[PDB]
Amino acid sequence: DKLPYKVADIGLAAWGRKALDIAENEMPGLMRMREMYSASKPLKGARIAGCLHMTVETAVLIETLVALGAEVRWSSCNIFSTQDHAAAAIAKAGIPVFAWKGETDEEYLWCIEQTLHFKDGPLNMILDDGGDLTNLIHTKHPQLLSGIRGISEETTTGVHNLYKMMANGILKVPAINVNDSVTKSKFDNLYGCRESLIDGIKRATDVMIAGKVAVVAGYGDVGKGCAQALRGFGARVIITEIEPINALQAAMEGYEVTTMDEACKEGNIFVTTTGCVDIILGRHFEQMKDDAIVCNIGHFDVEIDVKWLNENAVEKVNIKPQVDRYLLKNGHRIILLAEGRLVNLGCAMGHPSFVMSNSFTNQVMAQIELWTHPDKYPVGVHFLPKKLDEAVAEAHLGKLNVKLTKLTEKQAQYLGMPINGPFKPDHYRY
Template structure:
């Protein structure tokens, strides 16, 4: 089936982006060499629905090297990079995606991808899985299973599983150590501020930054804000995470209080309505709002539109909302993922770990999917450890090893 992309003439620039990140993803390079030699995925169709930028593109090419027929689509209307999509088509992959697609186009792209009747899916946020359980049950006829990239998507999977409605095995790659410990903390931490600073061209130092949510992503965003010289405030609903934020040196307070003092707000909760009408009413003039959770429901933009007398685009990816009392509030990237909708996403070295996990999850599903229960699974620790070991070796580091005597001391019952 023919690809649907914006402009194939952008392919040269897209391939340059893909080639650039490949230089910094040694773990995926190693796996790609093995996949190509073994033709691991020969005869398999893999649908990849992840934010379509250079690192995702490179993962897709690694799977193709292993013999797979790889179909790529986006997982967010604003995170697709048209030149990268064109680059993938030029490299022989099938792509359905373009930047700033409508909701209808986005759903069409997902359905086009599922028309290929995949053996394996790689999902980000759970939209593919949702379709496969509702309007596209026909696309499951060859499906062995899949993997999920994000916390939000894993929550949706677990809800399906608990309701005994999940109809194929899914691996929660997000719950692997080499994903959440590094991608969520260091990847999100850096890429969120890349997106904010690139979009606003403003300083962070000296400003009051409010981070909503202190999970692994929130930890990363708060840590980098502190490193940039900001005064950091955290809002939380979980007392354990809240006290962890306090012990990490941050002030914790309710959002309705934080709203009065914040200069920059970043939501990282995975929940909805984190910032709403009551918060907009007390915010400072020229406060900047953005979201780093998967869906665009954490910053309630509809509430803000209803309160504002007008709004206008004042800079690429910045919408200014003019309030009745003369204040302006700025929303970045329509409240969608600021690090991808207004930036290039996580650094290549971080995604080398995450996407190596995705590649091995696809291989695991290939070999074990037929025997796995229709549930949410986590990759064995040995897979995590192997990825970490490969990454360390590529960086020039080595480890101690246990002697047999030490191993027996730790693991043998006396």
């Protein structure tokens, strides 16, 4: 009857395997969860449904969940985020995958539905990134909410929506805040974007960063990280915000701060890290310098009113996959990347293996807590035990040769914490 998996070219399985083995070598954390729980298989009897850009990095994660005894039905939470060779490998591995690069929004949903029913019945766990899976089931298949033991959210947009469902009595299952995890937000969000964002602008535009004026919307971890990438290349970064604290940070860092109404007149490259709608309007395109490159890193595509463009451009010529050059009714052109969607994961390849492992480590730890200590997590959105947090970083210090110092009893007694024990307070903010 139904399909066992749907990928682009299963003949990409071998090239992706080499890719996977190479990525494994950079994923210290993840490989550590394997050589620690493979025998005890803590996720035995689990049937996980995931919605995460099927990238080479997600395969390493998916095989880490399978090594721990879990069953997995995958999907990518992006039509352009998928990496076909990473998929045509997981499929070959025997894991039913439904994801290719460039699925239509109609395809997108079919792929997610394919991962709701296993052989031993419906799913019992959710691994989400963006919130499509947790909401698609919370509103489209409310009869499965009961057989689902736990939820995991990858990104901020996903965790902001959870907190909403909660405050609106719509959350019927417990979810863990992976994103907000220091070793997650202060690494993947910041450091990750610092290298993947421009990798995306470059591969698609091949533009020279030095000289340009880049406007970044929002100064969050993704903003602080994005802004550091352009500025470090020779660009002049302006920043727009709605948060006093964040706004002061950006200025105290050398960044001019204004509105997009006045900044759209100077910028050559525009980047949205914002979590909400209408960041770059048509009233902004009408003032942008010629060939101005516009992209958005945020999760969903509604930061850039891509509609105004396709409905107000004298013409639109696609240069190549996920790259568009429009001709405005004023002469200027506006190279649009990934049709307004995630730029790093659609024009490039996402965050680097190392950084990606820091987040998946947290994802695997979360899946293990939820599926195993159900009593520890009542319906709501819980953080992950700091202890487990500090654990992710510790698992990666070896691959970087980081040599931690060691307190003595003299100091331990002095400070008051354990020479061997914890001391990382919950107030720290990093």
